[PDB]
Amino acid sequence: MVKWPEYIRLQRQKKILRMRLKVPPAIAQFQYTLDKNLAAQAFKLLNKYRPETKQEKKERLLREATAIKEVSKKPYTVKYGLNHVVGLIENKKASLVLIANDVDPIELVVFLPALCRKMGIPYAIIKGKARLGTLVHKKTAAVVAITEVRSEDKNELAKLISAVKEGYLEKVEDTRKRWGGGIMGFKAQKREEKRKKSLETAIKV
Amino acid sequence: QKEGLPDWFLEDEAKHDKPIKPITKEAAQAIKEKLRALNARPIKKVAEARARRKLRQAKKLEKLK
């Protein structure tokens, strides 16, 4: 029949393989993310602490330079960068950690949920490294974190911490230890039953 | 895992993931004896093979002459 392009066939084969294979728990846990509401509530707080863009930083630098030519509070912003966030977790500075669910080498983030749990840091898994990227004005952010917020948002952050650990961490307390995958459809079940009946009589070895 | 995996995935590994282990000559001989057919070496067939053999040396001797 019609022949698909090679790269389209390859990535479609990976989609079926992702749901067919039984995946280890450290990678199975990345299947479970938070819902639409919790993502929106997180990004509502996170947007108010977005780092300044490349244009905004230059304008602030020009403003101060002009003033001196003719005394500030500590900036609060979202922390990003895998090496940066990991050090914040190890030093118990990160109040809340959000981890992407589609890091291409999964071994880069596979230890992050366990490390967050071992330190007592609340964490959640967000669908989209690109969505995290827009938050930090990058193409992709593997992980973002919040260390300290301003006084007007201290209560907002605390409520979101409780929401995540109640709405997300309790929901995965049992499924994070389990193997994932095994979503055999009708076609897969027919193949397995056919395989068994081919070995019912004789087993060539 | 093998239970619920597609044929294109499994057949690829079966071709490229066969463990390399040594084979003894005694094991190879037994398989040849076990899979030998009941009509592989009748008296007729062995006779023609020898007769075909003698002709080839006979013809080769003529090319030498």
Partner: peptide, 29 residues
């Protein structure tokens, strides 16, 4: 959801490829 239709399409081309690659022997045919 479970990828039943996508799987069925993928296995269909795999059998066609195997049949086509085996049919260029003329002793297999």
């Amino acid at each position: 959801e479970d990828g039943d239709q996508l799987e069925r399409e993928l296995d269909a081309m795999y059998e066609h490829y195997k049949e086509r690659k085996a049919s260029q022997d003329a002793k297999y045919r």
